[PDB]
Amino acid sequence: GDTKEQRILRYVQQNAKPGDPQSVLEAIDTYCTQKEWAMNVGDAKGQIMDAVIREYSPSLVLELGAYCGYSAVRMARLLQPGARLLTMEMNPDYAAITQQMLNFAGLQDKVTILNGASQDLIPQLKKKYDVDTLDMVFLDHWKDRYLPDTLLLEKCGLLRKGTVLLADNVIVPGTPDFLAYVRGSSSFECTHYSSYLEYMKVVDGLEKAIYQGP
């Protein structure tokens, strides 16, 4: 009784300043550097994420896997007014942590949390949420869903030329099938950003894959 995710949030509520997203991010990072490792994107990879976001200024972002709401907070705090983030989370407990994390950050009005698995929700985006195409996609869910969900996004017509895919953990725990596909495919221009597994000295990285169209 009493999960790590609940402890992380409790620490944020005690040490972070309400309505200040930088503060919420620093609290989580501190908690996870000092007390318990947890699978947030972390500040090192979060900084690359920030740079990618500022470059494209997406109006509509889709995130796969929210977890505690760390990357959701990172991204939604950089979004222009009227720009939105959709985040898919299959575990209702983590989704609740995320909602409260975003509420504390004062970012709740920029984000919609979708409850359910990506494979079930993605085919419903156009019909049930009036989504034309996506400006950007952050992949941070089950590693072996990266490729299937990409092909699924393409099938559902959610990708246009210019859609940026940003994938966490392509080295650790690794997504070798996703990497071979986007790199080998002329439908994706790919950039690797070398970095470190969150809160550790193990080499990890993000992959940016830009859809070129059919």
Nearest Cα to Cα of residue 60 among 45, 44, 76 = 76
Position with the least CB separation from Mg ion? 168
Total residues in contact with Mg ion, by rule CB under 5 A: 3
Determine the distance from the C-alpha atom of residue 128 to the mean position of all C-alpha atoms in its chain, rounded to a whole number: 21
Residue of 98, 169, 175, 195 interacting with Mg ion (CB under 5 A):
169
Residue 10 or 161 with smaller CB distance to ligand FBN:
10
End-to-end CA distance of the chain: 50
To ligand FBN, the closest distance from the beta carbon of 73 in angstroms equals 14
Active site residue 26: no
Residue 109, amino acid: D
Question: Which one of 29, 143, 204, 208 is the catalytic residue?
Answer: 143
Residue 36 or 80 with smaller CB distance to ligand FBN:
36
| Cα(207)–Cα(198) distance, integer angstroms | 15
| 142, interface contact from Mg ion, ligand FBN, none, CB < 5-8 Å by kind | ligand FBN
Residue 213: count other Cβ atoms within 10 Å of its Cβ: 10
How large is the C-alpha radius of gyration of the chain?
16
Residue of 5, 29, 168, 207 interacting with Mg ion (CB under 5 A):
168
| Cα(123)–Cα(126) distance, integer angstroms | 7
175 sits near Mg ion (criterion: CB under 5 A): no
Active site residue 103: no
Active site residue 169: yes
| Cα(21)–Cα(44) distance, integer angstroms | 16
| Cα(109)–Cα(171) distance, integer angstroms | 33
Active site residue 20: no
Residue 122 DSSP label: G
Choose one: 18-26, 148-156, 162-170, 203-211; the region binding Mg ion (CB under 5 A): 162-170
Active site residue 168: yes
Give the residue ranges of the annotated binding site for Mg(2+).
140, 168-169
In the three-class reduction of DSSP (H, G, I as helix; E, B as strand; rest coil), residue 113 is classed as: strand
To ligand FBN, the closest distance from the beta carbon of 42 in angstroms equals 8
The residues assigned a catalytic role are 140, 143, 168-169, 198
Q: Which residues contact Mg ion by CB under 5 A?
A: 140, 168-169
